[PDB]
Design an enzyme around this catalytic site. Structure first.
Site, PDB file in Angstrom:
ATOM      1  N   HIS A   5     114.105 -34.443  99.469  1.00  0.00           N
ATOM      2  CA  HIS A   5     112.766 -33.953  99.123  1.00  0.00           C
ATOM      3  C   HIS A   5     111.751 -34.712  99.983  1.00  0.00           C
ATOM      4  CE1 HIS A   5     109.757 -32.691  95.872  1.00  0.00           C
ATOM      5  NE2 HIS A   5     109.111 -33.677  96.474  1.00  0.00           N
ATOM      6  N   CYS A  33     101.648 -35.896  94.922  1.00  0.00           N
ATOM      7  CA  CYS A  33     101.562 -36.457  93.573  1.00  0.00           C
ATOM      8  C   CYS A  33     100.203 -37.103  93.368  1.00  0.00           C
ATOM      9  CB  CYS A  33     102.667 -37.489  93.339  1.00  0.00           C
ATOM     10  SG  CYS A  33     102.535 -38.424  91.767  1.00  0.00           S
TER      11      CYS A  33
HETATM   12  C1  COA Z   1     105.686 -40.300  81.001  1.00  0.00           C
HETATM   13  C2  COA Z   1     104.330 -40.091  80.318  1.00  0.00           C
HETATM   14  C3  COA Z   1     104.456 -38.957  79.294  1.00  0.00           C
HETATM   15  C4  COA Z   1     103.900 -41.365  79.599  1.00  0.00           C
HETATM   16  O1  COA Z   1     102.544 -41.148  79.137  1.00  0.00           O
HETATM   17  P1  COA Z   1     101.953 -42.069  77.964  1.00  0.00           P
HETATM   18  O2  COA Z   1     100.650 -41.476  77.539  1.00  0.00           O
HETATM   19  O3  COA Z   1     101.998 -43.508  78.360  1.00  0.00           O
HETATM   20  O4  COA Z   1     103.066 -41.818  76.847  1.00  0.00           O
HETATM   21  P2  COA Z   1     103.129 -42.202  75.294  1.00  0.00           P
HETATM   22  O5  COA Z   1     104.489 -41.837  74.801  1.00  0.00           O
HETATM   23  O6  COA Z   1     102.616 -43.592  75.107  1.00  0.00           O
HETATM   24  O7  COA Z   1     102.049 -41.150  74.763  1.00  0.00           O
HETATM   25  C5  COA Z   1     102.425 -40.359  73.627  1.00  0.00           C
HETATM   26  C6  COA Z   1     101.550 -39.135  73.558  1.00  0.00           C
HETATM   27  O8  COA Z   1     101.871 -38.283  74.693  1.00  0.00           O
HETATM   28  C7  COA Z   1     102.733 -37.252  74.264  1.00  0.00           C
HETATM   29  N1  COA Z   1     103.831 -37.088  75.219  1.00  0.00           N
HETATM   30  C8  COA Z   1     104.790 -38.010  75.565  1.00  0.00           C
HETATM   31  N2  COA Z   1     105.656 -37.538  76.434  1.00  0.00           N
HETATM   32  C9  COA Z   1     105.239 -36.235  76.672  1.00  0.00           C
HETATM   33  C10 COA Z   1     105.746 -35.211  77.495  1.00  0.00           C
HETATM   34  N3  COA Z   1     106.826 -35.346  78.257  1.00  0.00           N
HETATM   35  N4  COA Z   1     105.090 -34.022  77.485  1.00  0.00           N
HETATM   36  C11 COA Z   1     104.003 -33.898  76.710  1.00  0.00           C
HETATM   37  N5  COA Z   1     103.439 -34.789  75.897  1.00  0.00           N
HETATM   38  C12 COA Z   1     104.116 -35.948  75.926  1.00  0.00           C
HETATM   39  C13 COA Z   1     103.176 -37.653  72.858  1.00  0.00           C
HETATM   40  O9  COA Z   1     103.665 -36.594  72.065  1.00  0.00           O
HETATM   41  C14 COA Z   1     101.882 -38.281  72.347  1.00  0.00           C
HETATM   42  O10 COA Z   1     100.899 -37.277  72.112  1.00  0.00           O
HETATM   43  P3  COA Z   1      99.739 -37.840  71.134  1.00  0.00           P
HETATM   44  O11 COA Z   1      98.732 -38.594  71.985  1.00  0.00           O
HETATM   45  O12 COA Z   1      99.128 -36.626  70.459  1.00  0.00           O
HETATM   46  O13 COA Z   1     100.440 -38.749  70.142  1.00  0.00           O
HETATM   47  C15 COA Z   1     103.252 -39.758  81.352  1.00  0.00           C
HETATM   48  O14 COA Z   1     103.005 -40.909  82.147  1.00  0.00           O
HETATM   49  C16 COA Z   1     103.624 -38.602  82.265  1.00  0.00           C
HETATM   50  O15 COA Z   1     103.651 -37.452  81.838  1.00  0.00           O
HETATM   51  N6  COA Z   1     103.898 -38.910  83.524  1.00  0.00           N
HETATM   52  C17 COA Z   1     104.390 -37.937  84.491  1.00  0.00           C
HETATM   53  C18 COA Z   1     103.360 -37.650  85.553  1.00  0.00           C
HETATM   54  C19 COA Z   1     103.914 -36.766  86.650  1.00  0.00           C
HETATM   55  O16 COA Z   1     104.504 -35.722  86.379  1.00  0.00           O
HETATM   56  N7  COA Z   1     103.714 -37.178  87.908  1.00  0.00           N
HETATM   57  C20 COA Z   1     104.019 -36.380  89.087  1.00  0.00           C
HETATM   58  C21 COA Z   1     105.476 -35.996  89.162  1.00  0.00           C
HETATM   59  S1  COA Z   1     106.564 -37.438  89.033  1.00  0.00           S
HETATM   60 ZN    ZN Z   2     107.232 -34.479  95.714  1.00  0.00          ZN
END
Ligand code: COA
Ligand code: ZN
Ligand code: COA
Ligand code: ZN
Lengths: 305, 305
Positions: free
Chosen positions: A207, A240
């Protein structure tokens, strides 16, 4: 003579990597339309969206409805990107055909992107496999494989250790991602040769992003040492939002044109793909980094003055 | 260990190929300033302008004053592009160090660009050599070597015949130019391998445009079969106004970055060249197709959030 092993397998990621960083929202039914059109182009895999926090990636927060709404071609695997168990469960509810688990080889990038350490990412992956093995199929991605925009050089031993950890969980399909386009062809040959001593060309995806203009050169270098599966985005969309200065994936129609001119087989309809890419400026409101959409293919000749 | 033969010789053409198609006029003293800055970057050859009809290429009609005004570095060859005897005589009066004679392998393109047949072009070249041999030095360019935007495929036997005609005139330095970016790496390896059975790597220049995104891939393919001299334009400027849909040369700083990351020696100061390229938007009033000017090199790291 053409050989079974020669085929370069083009995998489309514009609905996920392409749209996650686009400035403007693409409406849900137009995301569905785009995937439906891509489904007619010959791809074996299309990454149709992500199941991630809507606070992190608001552009992809309609993933469930996108996966619900698209026309499923029986011979296409529709992939969803997954960061943790909550996303895996959402993806299974949406009947994603394959769950693409992602972490970064860079601890700093994994914290910036996933808000957890690599160890925490793999703790989630272990629970995902424990609950969903036999109910879906998995791909394991190692981001920042070729360098990190925060940390710089990335240990190749660490990349291999992460690949081995995926294998220990029974995940033998692996993507190595050049998240901010830091890879060079010699480095690519070394890393790909080594990973192909662990997994097969049917299992490895590369990728590449084109941030420093080496994307297609890196594809060809990987192909020369046996790699066959490559991610690309229509029109060269992508990047990203949490990798600073990230930019487009390699452009699908530029990749397919390279293969078509060299003689590397693909199953992609290049003429139709160029026509589809040329609809992107009207959809997104700006031009995209596609050389073939701008210039047309070699056989588009010009009238004599 | 580093070998004498490993060096990739980067040759700069932005003052000629880059500016001839730019929409806006670059004032004479700013053309001089640009060349003076390029002269500090490590190039062995800089194509400083053309001696062509001002009706054909109005952007380069100040070639005499540019060549008069630049600071001459003793170890740089300042090249002028020449289409006929009148231009050769102008270039000698301006003390161009080298005259780059140009014709196209495509009869249609030669008529569109030079308003004469290939035979008429070589009739002029014969008179140029007869009058100026021993008073200057020569390069012979074959344009549309890899295909033509009007005719399509171009006979490789015809390319070789034109190279041989240059040699018969005593012109053993040869440029093969991909005028509208139609070349692919397999084709490049075949043509370059054959021409290197006629001339040496010290004599052959490859001049690729990036119209279909294969420019750097074609450079590396040519390097792999022994070619060492390559033309490039700062910022990815360039294109011929009479080749329809022509676009930029390969970008000099993207080429030098590729070499620097792979380990191919150059004599170019990459950091300084990127800084110079980043002054182009202010000079020209638009951005240019340089990946390195946009993203910076790998070692430009980003602060942790
Ligand atoms: C991994 C990730 C979910 C962690 O986020 P975070 O806010 O620190 O996670 P927490 O578990 O502490 O937060 C929990 C909250 O988020 C929600 N949540 C956690 N994982 C989730 C997911 N995969 N999809 C949707 N909601 C999610 C929980 O249900 C909760 O909702 P609430 O605020 O109503 O309680 C986030 O950083 C993320 O989505 N990163 C990916 C980003 C991305 O795709 N980057 C580019 C491609 S790699
Ligand atoms: Zn990429
Ligand atoms: C080759 C070329 C000069 C032929 O043009 P043309 O108008 O058909 O040429 P003619 O000899 O019939 O025209 C003669 C006139 O042009 C002038 N002229 C001819 N060659 C010239 C040259 N090299 N430089 C400047 N003026 C030139 C003559 O002195 C005469 O001027 P006049 O009108 O006052 O009498 C022109 O097509 C040309 O410059 N092409 C190159 C374009 C180019 O650089 N393309 C991109 C890079 S390959
Ligand atoms: Zn050119």
């Amino acid at each position: 003579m053409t050989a079974f092993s020669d085929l370069l397998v083009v995998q489309e990621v514009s609905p996920r990597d392409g749209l996650q960083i686009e400035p403007t929202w693409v409406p849900t039914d137009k995301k569905i339309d785009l995937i439906n059109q891509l489904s007619t182009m010959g791809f074996s895999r299309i990454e149709a969206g992500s199941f991630v926090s809507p606070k992190a990636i608001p552009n992809l927060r309609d993933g469930e409805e996108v996966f619900t709404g698209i026309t499923r071609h029986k011979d296409i695997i529709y992939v969803g990107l997954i960061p943790n168990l909550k996303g895996a469960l959402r993806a299974v509810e949406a009947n994603a055909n394959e769950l693409n688990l992602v972490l970064s080889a860079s601890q700093t990038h994994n914290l910036a992107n996933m808000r957890m350490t690599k160890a925490q990412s793999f703790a989630g992956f272990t629970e995902i496999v424990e609950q969903l093995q036999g109910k879906t199929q998995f791909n394991g991605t190692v981001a920042t494989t070729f360098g990190c925009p925060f940390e710089g050089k990335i240990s190749e031993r660490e990349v291999f250790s992460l690949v081995e950890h995926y294998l220990k969980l029974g995940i033998h399909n692996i993507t190595l991602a050049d998240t901010t386009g830091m890879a060079n062809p010699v480095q690519v040959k070394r890393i790909v040769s080594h990973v192909l001593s662990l997994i097969s060309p049917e299992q490895l995806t590369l990728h590449f992003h084109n941030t420093r203009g080496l994307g297609l050169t890196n594809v060809l270098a990987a192909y020369e040492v046996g790699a066959r599966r490559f991610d690309a985005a229509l029109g060269g969309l992508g990047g990203c939002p949490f990798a600073p200065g990230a930019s487009g994936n390699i452009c699908t129609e530029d990749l397919v044109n390279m293969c078509e001119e060299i003689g590397i087989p693909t199953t992609i309809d290049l003429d139709a793909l160029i026509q589809l890419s040329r609809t992107l400026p009207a959809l997104l409101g700006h031009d995209t980094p596609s050389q073939l959409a701008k210039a047309g293919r070699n056989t588009d000749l010009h009238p004599i003055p």
